[PDB]
């Protein structure tokens, strides 16, 4: 740092820590007892004094309040969960109803999950629907179903995708590239968990050749249709060709829609690109704020959950029993979660396409205004977008930029996926725009352009 | 079947189906759209007309009502989640509080997880606590932490244990026993996920020899201290030796307390056997009815989550950073879940040891009564027990026996782990005994002894 930059940083740190001193003290006091990876976010030794997560006390609509009483316009929105803002009326009413109703328990099967599955079919075109406890679990199950249905083991995923924390997806590409096995992402992940994993470049044509030439050996291609980390990469022709290749080879095309599902539109990315996957994973929005992961798709693959359907009154039996895999789960189809998922689906189906048109348009406005400002002021920042997911792209110190946004009342978690919600008003969008402009001005004054 | 047995079975199926015809119809009408392995429970082609799960509509205390309006004394209790029965007052109050408080959102870190971790440390003696979304996730993380801390890969589990649905624990012992690699439990689980897994006999003294002769090669021994499947096997000496062995070899002892934790007593199986593991997994009870899985244990192993603890005001830093692994999770430390967990811990800590003494004594009474009845009536059935967990062991057709119990209004899920709760009354226990005795008398009269 130049002296001018050092002087600015020291003054900013003092004001930042004073504003969020309670989050700092809570983090330091609980760090040992409560082990959490997020207590390392953007750690650097020379500014370790402002390296701590923001601790929340309250939320409502587009707003979050921290334990220092600071108010934020929230563009984290529960990592993408809170499409409708915090505590939408129909979610709150669902919880209120559950306190008065002698809610059925875990143990017996759910009396609501059937209608949830029906409405997911109506919204998305999937054939069969299964319920688990996180997006991570849903991805793990989806891979198992593809392998069980096909009798194969090898799976392709794309570099820069995120698919949860199942060890079988936690790899990085081989030194030699191609169809060679992955290496572990981190300590504690054994090489054996990488032997059936292949990581390829997304939207590189030669990846389509590797997959084509791998052919009948691949149990699945697992794709994040729009990768959250690069919202602007929307490779329709790559995805359509991937669909044609895997269909011909009998390989499961698994689309990870844990973010794009129920966000870009009611039918998710499948509907946006008009591509029907074999298996899809859903999560985040679809639980209504409750934890949820879903695997859904074509019977040819989903039959490995129950061995396939059959009827009463005849001699039918599960015809896919020889390919049925092992699945389970204590908290599957939780009674409150199923009622919240039902409330989300009821609301989305009643509100119709205009909900998404208005929300996507509101995000396009935010992205367009900021990109014009960056161009007008010659700032090396750019907004990228897919629907109501958006991100900042910059060569300025990203960590320093986001500390300013958070300081100015715009809450951005460390992973930096940003979302608008149906609860974000015109006033809120203007506030975000102003906070970004003041941040550019401040960093310019500090010598950080 | 003899004609006596055949006619009895035909009559039983007719009355069973008539009593639960709504659950049959709901299962039939939702089977395709809602894919769920539990729909295959106790399938046999010759009695398929009564093959369907019970669909629940209501619950309260020790009771559950199905969608036909039939009332049950529930001894499934959420697969062991519901230590206090359904809707204990302090849990309902937590849900009520959450609807009028503007709960903090997902996104920012939790303002309550510190106290939850502190109380778990006070209850169990663990040093550090981390929160994930299912017991399955907790076990998967715990294995990763042990592998990261030790730099080793191979893990021992014991046959007949259950540790969730992470593919890395879903194996059967090698056809040659001993220290050979496991094989997949089911289709869809690749052999690569088995190569770092070893499956040994539980409580056989030679299993400790095989572990001994493996030396420093094991990242961990994962043990279900009492296996849910065999509650009577409580091998204290075997566990004490297993602790001493792994301690000397620097191998992680991971105790899976997802069932025994907070059930046998406040400190779990660790407190019952007076053994301190390196890592422990909790789940089920500790979420208060919300989904939850926890990995906790000694800093030497838990430090792989955040790199180890540090302080503001000095030059300290994460000192285990080279061994830090990868963990994440959208729904970690969910605001409602953390508050329910806090409510469970506060209630347990206030109520004290007599809560467990009464509940364990109640279960012992039920077990002793039934075993006395079986002995006096010369019936080949026995009860086994660990605390408030109990199971039936019988050479009589188990599925037929349990169809009778369910028909008589005692709810037993297909997995047959049974539980009492603090809500089971004197009337409830007597009705459970009566249902079992009538079941034996009906079966004897039908020719099934
Ligand atoms: C968040 C996410 C996951 C993992 O979901 P969890 O519920 O956090 O396990 C997987 N895939 C994608 C695309 C996601 O955005
Ligand atoms: C239920 C259970 C698990 C898995 O827990 P889920 O929350 O269902 O994933 C793991 N281990 C043991 C001992 C259990 O009883």
Short mmCIF file of N, CA, C and O and ligand atoms in Angstrom, two decimals, chain A residues 134-136 162-164 224 256 258-259 284, chain B residues 329-331, ligand 1:
data_model
loop_
_atom_site.label_atom_id
_atom_site.label_comp_id
_atom_site.label_asym_id
_atom_site.label_seq_id
_atom_site.Cartn_x
_atom_site.Cartn_y
_atom_site.Cartn_z
N UNK A 134 -31.05 -31.34 2.14
CA UNK A 134 -30.20 -30.23 1.74
C UNK A 134 -29.95 -30.37 0.25
O UNK A 134 -30.19 -31.43 -0.33
N UNK A 135 -29.45 -29.30 -0.35
CA UNK A 135 -29.03 -29.39 -1.74
C UNK A 135 -27.89 -30.37 -1.91
O UNK A 135 -27.83 -31.14 -2.87
N UNK A 136 -26.97 -30.38 -0.94
CA UNK A 136 -25.86 -31.33 -0.93
C UNK A 136 -26.37 -32.76 -0.98
O UNK A 136 -25.88 -33.58 -1.78
N UNK A 162 -20.60 -25.27 -8.58
CA UNK A 162 -20.77 -25.63 -7.18
C UNK A 162 -21.95 -26.58 -7.08
O UNK A 162 -23.03 -26.29 -7.62
N UNK A 163 -21.75 -27.70 -6.40
CA UNK A 163 -22.78 -28.73 -6.32
C UNK A 163 -22.97 -29.21 -4.88
O UNK A 163 -23.43 -30.32 -4.67
N UNK A 164 -22.63 -28.39 -3.90
CA UNK A 164 -22.70 -28.84 -2.52
C UNK A 164 -21.40 -29.46 -2.04
O UNK A 164 -20.34 -29.35 -2.68
N UNK A 224 -24.22 -27.35 -13.83
CA UNK A 224 -24.90 -26.17 -13.31
C UNK A 224 -25.25 -25.32 -14.52
O UNK A 224 -24.37 -24.64 -15.07
N UNK A 256 -28.29 -29.11 -12.12
CA UNK A 256 -28.33 -28.63 -10.75
C UNK A 256 -29.02 -27.28 -10.73
O UNK A 256 -28.42 -26.25 -11.05
N UNK A 258 -30.45 -25.88 -7.96
CA UNK A 258 -30.68 -25.50 -6.58
C UNK A 258 -30.76 -23.98 -6.45
O UNK A 258 -31.54 -23.46 -5.63
N UNK A 259 -30.08 -23.23 -7.32
CA UNK A 259 -30.24 -21.77 -7.39
C UNK A 259 -31.21 -21.34 -8.49
O UNK A 259 -32.09 -20.51 -8.26
N UNK A 284 -32.99 -24.51 -1.92
CA UNK A 284 -33.08 -23.08 -1.59
C UNK A 284 -34.53 -22.56 -1.61
O UNK A 284 -35.25 -22.78 -0.64
N UNK B 329 -22.70 -25.02 3.60
CA UNK B 329 -24.06 -25.45 3.87
C UNK B 329 -25.02 -24.29 3.99
O UNK B 329 -24.89 -23.46 4.90
N UNK B 330 -26.00 -24.26 3.09
CA UNK B 330 -26.97 -23.17 3.06
C UNK B 330 -27.74 -23.06 4.36
O UNK B 330 -27.93 -21.97 4.91
N UNK B 331 -28.20 -24.20 4.89
CA UNK B 331 -29.13 -24.17 6.00
C UNK B 331 -28.46 -24.38 7.34
O UNK B 331 -29.17 -24.52 8.34
C1 LIG C 1 -26.32 -24.06 -2.56
C2 LIG C 1 -26.14 -24.98 -3.71
C3 LIG C 1 -25.88 -26.43 -3.51
C4 LIG C 1 -25.79 -27.00 -2.11
O1 LIG C 1 -26.98 -26.70 -1.39
P1 LIG C 1 -27.03 -26.84 0.21
O2 LIG C 1 -28.51 -26.80 0.53
O3 LIG C 1 -26.25 -25.65 0.71
O4 LIG C 1 -26.37 -28.18 0.47
C5 LIG C 1 -25.71 -27.25 -4.62
N1 LIG C 1 -25.78 -26.80 -5.88
C6 LIG C 1 -26.01 -25.50 -6.19
C7 LIG C 1 -26.07 -25.06 -7.63
C8 LIG C 1 -26.21 -24.50 -5.11
O5 LIG C 1 -26.44 -23.19 -5.39
#
